[PDB]
Amino acid sequence: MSTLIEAIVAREVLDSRGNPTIEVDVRLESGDVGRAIVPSGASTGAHEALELRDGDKSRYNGKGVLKAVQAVNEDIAEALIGFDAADQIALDQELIALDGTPNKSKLGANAILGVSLAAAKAAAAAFGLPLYRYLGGVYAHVLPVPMMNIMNGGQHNSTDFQEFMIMPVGAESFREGLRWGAEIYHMLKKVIHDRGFSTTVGDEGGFAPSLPTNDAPLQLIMEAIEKAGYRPGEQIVIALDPATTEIFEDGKYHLKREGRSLSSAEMVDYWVDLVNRYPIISLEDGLAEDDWEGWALLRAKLGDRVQLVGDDFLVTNVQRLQRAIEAKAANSILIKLNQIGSLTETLSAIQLAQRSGWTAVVSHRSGESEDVTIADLVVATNAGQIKTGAPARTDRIAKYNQLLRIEEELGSAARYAGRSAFKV
Amino acid sequence: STLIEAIVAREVLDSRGNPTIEVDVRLESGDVGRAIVPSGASTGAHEALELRDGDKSRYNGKGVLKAVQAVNEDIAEALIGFDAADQIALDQELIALDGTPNKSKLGANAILGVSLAAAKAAAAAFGLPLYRYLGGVYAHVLPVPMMNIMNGGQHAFQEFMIMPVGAESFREGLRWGAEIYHMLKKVIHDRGFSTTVGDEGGFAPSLPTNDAPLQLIMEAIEKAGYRPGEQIVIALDPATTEIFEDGKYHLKREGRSLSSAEMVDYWVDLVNRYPIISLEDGLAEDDWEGWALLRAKLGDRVQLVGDDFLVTNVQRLQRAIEAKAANSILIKLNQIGSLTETLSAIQLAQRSGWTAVVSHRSGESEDVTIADLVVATNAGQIKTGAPARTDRIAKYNQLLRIEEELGSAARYAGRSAFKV
Ligand SMILES: [Mg+2]
Ligand SMILES: [Mg+2]
Ligand SMILES: [Mg+2]
Ligand SMILES: [Mg+2]
């Protein structure tokens, strides 16, 4: 096939926020070239892969990526020219070995992921296989139900909770499900203005108004689902990302707009009440980063009927995930490629969660790009769920278009996750 | 080998979440060209009309299934076995097949998609980058971007943009503009609030005066470490949409109002105080007497761009050239409908001493053809929005790639972009 690496070149490009990022090109003996743009975004922690920014305040306010570009054009290229790109595992374990650090701090998670991803793409093109087939094999065919970000809050009048998303569970295909969501998001754009507010997008595309209650965004969403012609529960469900680790502050959980506080036990009580009122199927970071005792209590009270997704709580970390699997601290994990740093390690987290009865929710980043790897990765692993944001900005829309293509390409083999995406 | 083997169209979404057509052209060589043809919509009748279904049960009538059927059936049957390397011939076949002068039978969106995808497929077959296949050996000029950093009006003076003329490369001009866009997003927060962004990246804040957005921009330029006039210059698209005529020049809120002659005198005031190199749609769509007066007054110092005034139409471009109504035209691929017709309009303006400003549409895509088209024609200028959304960043990223690929051959337009 001639899958041996000939060239590894990197350049500094811009992300969806206009911040510098790394784009890597892996050229094979065959002549095939794989290209990858690496994302970023938000304040995350608790043992994660570190990306390499320049720190040169005279270029992009210190956010430059040239040091990472160097690591690829020199260090990585020297080590991998002549390596077989068709050996993803061996390559990723060569990239990890070359770095030497456990958090990919010497070369950068961004340089390692760039090469990790471009290598796979280069190889897929060499075999003449679509990326989802190359990655997941002959049984890669499940189109995910998207968690579409139609409404925003948290911190940039606010709002205590951050993300309010809709899920087209009842649709027959990804194509129809994307239409439903698009239609509802546009109905919410009509409803918002027709209630006395403004309508411009965010970083994903969600509308961020100034509301009086925490139940108001759920009430508005319910109206937009109905006035669009869709049945709540049966056709459309709600997925929330309150990102409570933001309002934690030395124990208690501070609800400024509701003038309340309490402990994890009463924070759990709040979710149980809200879940009984709205068709909420998923809740991500309902409790804080390290409130491990709280998480298990939320699992016991809602885990039988609500998908509880570890985001900042699990940070796509295989050691944290193994603890949360054992502890019974959640039933779902949000997957971010650049939080772990390699394609092999990502697939390992996805498989560890999936084989433990958990669901893996492949997520995008705040600063995305024209790169649509997560669309082929979500199908390759038959994840059944994707978090890519509003059907608005091309950062988000590009992934939706790739899922439209993957579905078309699969033909009769294509199968939409539907209610099967969930463990409920 | 470069003969067309298959033409496949699908319905995808644009940057606004509205259906758009994507066209794939597959050659006997095995090469596939793919083009996303989205839509903007400024003013009627555009002289090239796209095909939207009108079925309100799907995407509130904004669906493009009819255009997909025109491509998969009408256009596919007619072009299979056609040499895709023959751009002009293929484009005159698409024009023939439609038969209407506005491309209303098949849809402008169906024709442009096949038109661009056929080029991409051929460029890949010869193994040449798109700008080289399009423009030949002398395609090497990197454009000075028109970076939108402020808005106002509808589709949430209208557009306020910066132009990094002083830079030594596109790469440094891109940084300059991005740093100033980030510096201004701090001056809006420190001298007010409201910050959001969308659809057009340059956030629109509720301001007290009409000369004030220029004062905010001019501060942010100096606050970022950049020299106005020298390094950074201002380009304005006031628009004249809501500023309707008869009664002439409705200026609100300032209560100045009338007329077309007084309107020209306002632009001479801002230009003599602030560094404004370019003015687009400074007067109305069909105020031909006004444009001609506007050209005689400051056409020798300022670039006057005919956007809604010309609507990328050749017949009225010829008129405005003779009438000396402007010295620049804004080119929109979707507005004319084919590649051959775009290049034709670009060359006509360029060769009669005008400049060609290659522009994006309001609902864009991941499609990045305008970056290869702007270098292929050595146009010297691009208007592709703010350094924010991926619909806009994809284009800037492509220009970075084009520059790098050119190596020592690359030349940034700079001050030479303008005829002043
Ligand atoms: Mg987060
Ligand atoms: Mg979160
Ligand atoms: Mg317009
Ligand atoms: Mg305009």
Numbering used by the authors:
A (entry chain A): 1 to 156, 159 to 426
B (entry chain B): 2 to 157, 163 to 426
Reported in the publication:
Enolase (2-phospho-d-glycerate hydrolyase, EC 4.2.1.11) catalyzes the conversion of 2-phosphoglycerate (2-PGA) to phosphoenolpyruvate (PEP) during both glycolysis and gluconeogenesis in all three domains of life. In the present study, we purified enolase-1 from Chloroflexus aurantiacus (EnoCa), a thermophilic green non-sulfur bacterium that grows photosynthetically under anaerobic conditions. Each monomer of EnoCa contains an amino terminal domain that consists of a three-stranded β-sheet packed against three α-helices and a carboxy terminal domain that consists of an eightfold α/β-barrel; both domain features are typical of the enolase superfamily.
High-resolution crystal structures were obtained for the apo protein as well as proteins with 2-PGA and PEP bound in the active site. The EnoCa structure containing PEP (PEP EnoCa structure) exhibits the so-called “closed” conformation, where the L1 loop is located closer to the active site. Like the apo EnoCa structure, a metal ion was mapped to the active site in the 2-PGA and PEP structures. The presence of 2-PGA and PEP in the active site of EnoCa was confirmed by calculation of a simulated-annealing OMIT map. The second atom was identified as Mg2+. Mg2+(II) was coordinated with Ser43, water molecules, and phosphate atoms from PEP supporting the octahedral coordination sphere. PEP itself is bound by Glu165, Glu206, Lys338, Arg367, and Ser368.
